[PDB]
Amino acid sequence: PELPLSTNRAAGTQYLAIGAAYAVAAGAVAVAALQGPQLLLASPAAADPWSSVLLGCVAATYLRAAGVFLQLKAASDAAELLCWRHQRLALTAAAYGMVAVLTQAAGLASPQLLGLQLLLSVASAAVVANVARSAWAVTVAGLLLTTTIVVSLYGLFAAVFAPAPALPVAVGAWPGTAAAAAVMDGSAAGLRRLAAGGLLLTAAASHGLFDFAGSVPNPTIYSLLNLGFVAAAVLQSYFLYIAPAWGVNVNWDTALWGPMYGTAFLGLVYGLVALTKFDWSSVVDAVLRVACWFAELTMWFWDTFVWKFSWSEKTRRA
Amino acid sequence: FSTITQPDTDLIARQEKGTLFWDIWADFLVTAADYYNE
Amino acid sequence: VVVDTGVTEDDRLRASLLVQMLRYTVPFMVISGLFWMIHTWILD
Amino acid sequence: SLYFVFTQLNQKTFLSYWLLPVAG
Amino acid sequence: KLREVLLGQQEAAKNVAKQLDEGVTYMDWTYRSTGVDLSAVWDPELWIRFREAVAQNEP
Amino acid sequence: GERIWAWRNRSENERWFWEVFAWDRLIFPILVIVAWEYLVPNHLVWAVLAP
Ligand SMILES: CC(C)CCC[C@@H](C)[C@H]1CC[C@H]2[C@@H]3CC=C4C[C@@H](OC(=O)CCC(=O)O)CC[C@]4(C)[C@H]3CC[C@]12C
């Protein structure tokens, strides 16, 4: 019940096509975030930099989605859609679209939001559904990736499963307009619902990498996906590292910025540890070095100030 | 009992001096003697 | 007058317990070091 | 191949006893 | 090399010196940082007199 | 005398336990560690590294 060249080549072409689309659209929405939030949506409440930085996160995450599809390109080229772990990847890719569309029913920001989202989500639904019907007839870096998947899981499971937050009132804030002492709105809600999907994409990328290269197929050429998991990350962090200068309020709402900051930090430290290969036993050598030093210190202290070592120990020969 | 019957300073110093004079200096000049052989 | 105080630890018995051990052990170290100077650092 | 037991701790010196009165 | 770097600040350089001197006079930071409370055996007067003696060169 | 001989041939494990093992390798190290950690302030050099 193997997979001949037919389904393999069809899946490969599907993957490369949709992934190129996601990649170029990610670059486009990056420059659009650099332009403004009125680039794609119609909510008139979009005169704030927080929409801009949220959209920068959107950009980096769609870059990550491109990386995911290039990963599946490189993986299924050897017809590796037979092991149950690729079935896990595909079913979770389907769950991406599942949660996305059911939450779109639970809320929508602008027509183009559902446009792009349902576009590529229906692409995923069709491919995974029909190919899974066909298949029916057939350490340290690990710690970082595990915490990444669980932090992003928490970010989603908390953000969407509840309706929405309410901004601080700040009683007495210019009783006129300028939204001071007011509630929230379409722009905010939907732009945010996006960011959640971006962190979902990188969540799925990371769960795939963990459950696949937890024996760290071939462990190395994942170097492709690695770039897609690092590059985006650092650039994301960049924007965040200047969000205070941009005059944004990132601190009042933990349910959104927390996962973004934590995932950026985790991806950056993952890149760093992959550059020098902390072997999960080198920390043992570090702690042993510091303990040896402090042992050498307390021995000198004891022999100099408390009780000589030639006194307390026994002497031989008489 | 086993503390106050250890060798005092005299015997410890004698041991150290004996090792310095006989554990290195004796065998070394022994080697020299065989290389060169009252 | 700028009146200033210290830190004042609240334990009193865990604070003074490693300094009291030193107050009792250091005299022997001083005596041994002095006589060592005399009878070995000179009479090598 | 060993058991789960302490080691003797007083075959070298006698200083350890100094903690039993003091703590007491 | 350090002369210009020290002449630059001229305010932190006279804040850290003040803190360091007042902290070595009464060794009261010692318990929380090392565990041995050195303030019980330390004599601030003898240190102050040492300081002033070497400042005036009068043993 | 006969009773002592009989009892000594049946009690070798307990004799060694009470003579060589009870204090030196069971009670003394426990007491020593608990007593050290009773004194000795809540530092790290003192709680873990120096012991
Ligand atoms: C005197 C009264 C108050 C208590 C009696 C204490 C002893 C009878 C116990 C306490 C500690 C015990 C020891 C603690 C640890 C171990 C390791 C453990 O080794 C095994 O797994 C042996 C079993 C096997 O594989 O044969 C159990 C036996 C032994 C030596 C124990 C033997 C019996 C000891 C000395």
mmCIF file of C-alpha atoms in Angstrom, chain E residues 21 46-59:
data_model
loop_
_atom_site.group_PDB
_atom_site.id
_atom_site.type_symbol
_atom_site.label_atom_id
_atom_site.label_comp_id
_atom_site.label_asym_id
_atom_site.label_seq_id
_atom_site.Cartn_x
_atom_site.Cartn_y
_atom_site.Cartn_z
ATOM 1 C CA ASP E 21 34.316 54.329 51.910
ATOM 2 C CA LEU E 46 40.636 52.472 64.175
ATOM 3 C CA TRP E 47 39.852 52.531 60.460
ATOM 4 C CA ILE E 48 38.940 56.210 60.543
ATOM 5 C CA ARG E 49 42.184 56.987 62.356
ATOM 6 C CA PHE E 50 44.171 54.939 59.846
ATOM 7 C CA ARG E 51 42.541 56.871 57.007
ATOM 8 C CA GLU E 52 43.274 60.270 58.541
ATOM 9 C CA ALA E 53 46.819 59.275 59.468
ATOM 10 C CA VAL E 54 47.733 58.281 55.929
ATOM 11 C CA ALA E 55 45.942 61.383 54.650
ATOM 12 C CA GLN E 56 48.016 63.717 56.833
ATOM 13 C CA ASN E 57 51.188 61.585 57.015
ATOM 14 C CA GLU E 58 51.300 61.558 60.823
ATOM 15 C CA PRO E 59 51.761 58.023 62.157
#
